[PDB]
Amino acid sequence: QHLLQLTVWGIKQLQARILAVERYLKDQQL
Amino acid sequence: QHLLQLTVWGIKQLQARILAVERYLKDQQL
Amino acid sequence: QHLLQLTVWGIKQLQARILAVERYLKDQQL
């Protein structure tokens, strides 16, 4: 129903996925 | 014209780019 | 105040973070 709210949530989900990738690179020492 | 529609599409495009990175890490065995 | 404007900016910020990851993979030769 509230698509703008949904995009805010979607952006947060994608932020968490990018953060997990950044952290993975750090943790695996690339 | 419909900027909220455009942000939905943009989020989908970024999702595909993050997915490609996740898959690359897996495929290259990091 | 203008949440749709804010999501456009947020998407741009996430795009820059994904781009930095893509470039990192290239530069580190994975």
Count Cβ atoms below 10 Å from residue B11 Cβ, excluding itself: 20
Nearest to C3 by CA among A14, A8, A6, B14: A8
Give just the sign of the alpha carbon dihedral C1, C3, C4, C10: positive
Task: Give the integer Cα–Cα distance in Å for C21 and B1.
Answer: 31
- Chain B residues whose beta carbon lies within 8 Å of the beta carbon of residue A17: 18, 22
For chain C, the domain total comes to 1
Task: Give the integer Cα–Cα distance in Å for B24 and C5.
Answer: 32
Contacts (Cβ under 8 Å, ≥6 apart) of B15: A14
Greatest Cα-to-Cα distance within chain C, rounded to the nearest angstrom: 43
- Chain B residues whose beta carbon lies within 8 Å of the beta carbon of residue C24: none
H or E element that contains B19: helix B3-27
Resolution in A: 1.5
Contacts (Cβ under 8 Å, ≥6 apart) of B9: none
Nearest to B3 by CA among C19, C9, A17: C9
Give the domain extent around C9: 1-30
Task: Transcribe C3-18 into DSSP letters.
Answer: HHHHHHHHHHHHHHHH
> Which structural technique was applied?
X-ray
Which candidate from A7, A28, A30 shows the least CB-CB separation from B11? A7
CB B19 within 8 A of CB A18: no
Give just the sign of the alpha carbon dihedral B12, B18, B21, B22: negative
Contacts (Cβ under 8 Å, ≥6 apart) of C12: none
